[PDB]
Design a protein around this ligand. Structure first.
Ligand SMILES: N#C[C@@H]1CCC[C@@H]1Nc1nc(-c2cn[nH]c2)nc2c1CC=NC2=O
Length: 281
């Protein structure tokens, strides 16, 4: 028997955890005995694009980092991704809920961890393409893990990037301009997305000040298919998201430097870590 092999029959649902682009993540108790005593596991199954889920599973299965969600196994017939369950959930609902419990140092410790898990993925020649606060799970009050790899893709040989084919559900307000204009994803673009995730982190994931809403204040919520085009210009001009309320300038300058318009010019994760550690120590 394989410990990473999970039966569909023994996988009884409990509650829906999170919604993804193509996949659906629900909490299941895997109980082979059948008496509410099996371990609780997070289960990703496509809504009724198997190749992509299959590809995500081989990427996650070979990721071993303390700030990357642990792969628990699979479920075949047709496939389901079996991950570990983190009861505190994602930063999206934990941050507003525990504002009092989490302060600035804890917020920057989270950023270092996200940066770290990010570097591991990058050094293993993989590009995330979906780095936002809803994709970061809380291990404990001291530890956070990257919990979704739905749009993670391999970077082509001798190429500095992955050329994006389909992009119908690309999170545009989190995206770098090279992705908005050229539609080619670079590791440097995952750094742009980090800076935005960083803003959400500092605002405790607040709806009324989410990166979409704040960018709309600068372009307008009545332009539908022009939304993206205007956004590209606002960035060409030099404008960026505002400073979060009660965020220091030295932090905001690390956030601003996450938005250096060129990919060849833009910072790496290793630089951001050292930059963050310089504020914690
Ligand atoms: N991270 C992440 C992504 C977001 C899209 C699907 C996946 N979601 C998930 N969402 C949640 C969750 C808990 N509260 N709110 C969400 N928990 C988990 C996962 C994925 C894996 N393990 C979890 O414990």
């Amino acid at each position: 028997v394989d410990p990473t092999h999970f039966e569909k029959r023994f996988l009884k649902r409990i509650r829906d955890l999170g919604e993804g682009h193509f996949g659906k993540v629900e909490l299941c108790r895997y109980d082979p005995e059948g008496d509410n005593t099996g371990e609780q596991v997070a289960v990703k199954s496509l809504k009724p694009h198997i190749a992509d889920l299959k590809k995500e599973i081989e990427i996650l299965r070979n990721l071993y980092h303390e700030n990357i969600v642990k792969y628990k196994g699979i479920c075949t017939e047709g496939i389901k991704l079996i991950m570990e369950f983190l009861p505190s959930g994602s930063l999206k609902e934990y941050l507003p809920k525990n504002k009092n419990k989490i302060n600035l140092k804890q917020q920057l410790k989270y950023a270092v961890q996200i940066c770290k898990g990010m570097d591991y993925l990058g050094s293993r020649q993989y590009v995330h393409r979906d780095l936002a606060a809803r994709n970061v799970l809380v291990e404990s009050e001291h530890q956070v893990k990257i919990g979704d790899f739905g749009l993670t893709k391999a970077i082509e040989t001798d190429k500095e990037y992955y050329t994006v084919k389909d992009d119908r559900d690309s999170p545009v307000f989190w995206y770098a301009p090279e992705c908005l204009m050229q539609s080619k994803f670079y590791i440097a673009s995952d750094v742009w997305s980090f800076g935005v995730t960083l803003h959400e982190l500092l605002t405790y994931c607040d709806s009324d000040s989410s990166p979409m809403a704040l960018f709309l204040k600068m372009i307008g919520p009545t332009h539908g298919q022009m939304t993206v085009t205007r956004l590209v210009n606002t960035l060409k001009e030099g404008k960026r998201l505002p400073c979060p309320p009660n965020c220091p300038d030295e932090v905001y300058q690390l956030m601003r430097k996450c938005w250096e318009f060129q990919p060849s010019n833009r910072t790496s994760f290793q630089n951001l870590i050292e930059g963050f550690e310089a504020l914690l120590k």
